[PDB]
Copies of this chain bind each other. A is one copy, B any other.
Amino acid sequence: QSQILKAEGERQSAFLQAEARERSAEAEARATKMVSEAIASGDIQAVNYFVAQKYTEALQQIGSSSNSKVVM
């Protein structure tokens, strides 16, 4: 009996997760459309600049951590 009750629990959880998945997919679609229009209008170098600066910040935090051993 305990196992059957548990299984019913995961079933209901799966249904709720499916609903959340559909909503998140809707949001991703809207985001894709908006950024697609923005890129198609003007240019591509700006996106590369954004990627570069975010990557620079990530690399700085990777280097400046407590546990590491860099080599130049």
**Which chain A residues have a beta carbon within 8 Å of chain B's beta carbons?**
3-4, 6-47, 49-72
Contact = CB atoms under 8 A, between A and B. Distances in A.
Contact of A17 (B24, B40, B63, B67): B24
Interface of A is mostly: helix
Total identical chains: 2
Contact of A12 (B4, B9, B39, B42): B4
A44 to B, nearest CB: 7
A53 B47 CA distance: 10
Contacts of A26: 18, 34
A49 B45 CA distance: 12
Q: Which of A31, A51, A55 has the most CB of B within 10 A?
A: A31
